[PDB]
Design a protein around this ligand. Structure first.
Ligand SMILES: [Zn+2]
Lengths: 54, 49, 146, 46
């Protein structure tokens, strides 16, 4: 997903600190350590057609 | 960047489509109005002296 | 982790991306729950028409704009809530209609910036703004009237 | 459709006519407020 820094509103990237994987902002010292599972499913469209014809 | 994304739209597929542009912007160090103005001025062409 | 500084999901109405484990309202229902369901006061932000149906009272004129800056204190009109959800504002001889504005989700703080001194002033956070009202002239009534 | 209920009166106050400003933060959701953040200064031009 897309997450934004509460401080300045820039995009948050995922990096590694000294203890854990954390969201971080490229333009301010704001960080956020990851506590539990975070997921972003997309559910791409499946091929549904059987394609019998004629 | 959050204000830009708000202006573009809050539908999920809209953010999915517009994400690569944000990533390309973040790859460069353009984060202020002055930096973007300097980039554009670099990308400017003089009208025959 | 701190519970009041979590990362924000982009949808401002659904910022609760991580948890510890809205239907479009109408002005009649808005006020009805604001008074019947609860007795707590609320701060509203209403947009008035450009010219109010009045005259600048001894303001040295011209049929110019008559805004709230020219009117005096006291009762200036009544708010009517009819059946079927119609919400009117009888501001004297004419009646405007009041509808919901854009449903804002960002923070809006109503504050008072009082420059009591020419060198030092006070900022007084009066409250938070949640809902926006829009008042418009009932043009159909004004046209069929004359 | 008669005005069945809520014949609310509308008053006008000019005490804070010139001192009232509206501050809106386009990037801050309404759930998170600046009540707990200690402010240091406010510059302004009349
Ligand atoms: Zn930031």
């Amino acid at each position: 997903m897309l997450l934004f820094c509460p401080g300045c509103g820039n995009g948050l990237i995922v990096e590694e600190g000294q203890r854990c994987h954390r969201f971080a902002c490229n333009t301010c010292p704001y960080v956020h350590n990851i506590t539990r599972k975070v997921t972003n499913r997309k559910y791409p469209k499946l091929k549904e057609v059987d394609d019998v014809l004629g | 960047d959050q204000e830009i994304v708000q202006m573009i739209g809050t539908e999920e597929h809209v953010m999915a489509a517009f994400g690569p542009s944000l990533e390309e912007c973040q790859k460069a160090q353009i984060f202020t109005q002055m930096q973007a103005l300097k980039y554009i001025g670099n990308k400017v062409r003089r009208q025959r002296m | 982790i701190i519970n009041i500084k979590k990362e924000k999901r982009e949808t401002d109405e659904e910022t609760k991306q991580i948890l510890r484990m809205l239907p479009k309202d109408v002005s009649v229902a808005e006020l009805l729950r604001e008074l019947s369901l609860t007795k707590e006061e609320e701060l509203l932000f209403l947009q008035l028409p450009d010219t109010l149906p009045g005259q600048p009272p001894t303001q040295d004129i011209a049929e110019n704009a008559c805004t709230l800056a020219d009117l005096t204190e006291g009762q200036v009109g009544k708010l009517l809530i009819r059946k079927s959800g119609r919400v009117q504002l009888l501001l004297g001889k004419v009646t405007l209609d009041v509808t919901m504005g854009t449903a804002c989700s960002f923070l809006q703080e109503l504050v008072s910036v009082g420059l009591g001194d020419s060198r030092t002033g006070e900022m007084t956070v009066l409250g938070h703004v949640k809902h926006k009202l829009v008042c418009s002239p009932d043009f159909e009534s004004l046209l069929d009237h004359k | 459709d008669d005005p069945v209920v809520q014949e609310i009166d509308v008053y006008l106050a000019k005490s804070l006519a010139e001192k009232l400003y509206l501050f809106q933060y386009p990037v801050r959701p309404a759930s998170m407020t600046y009540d707990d953040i200690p402010h240091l200064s406010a510059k302004i031009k009349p």
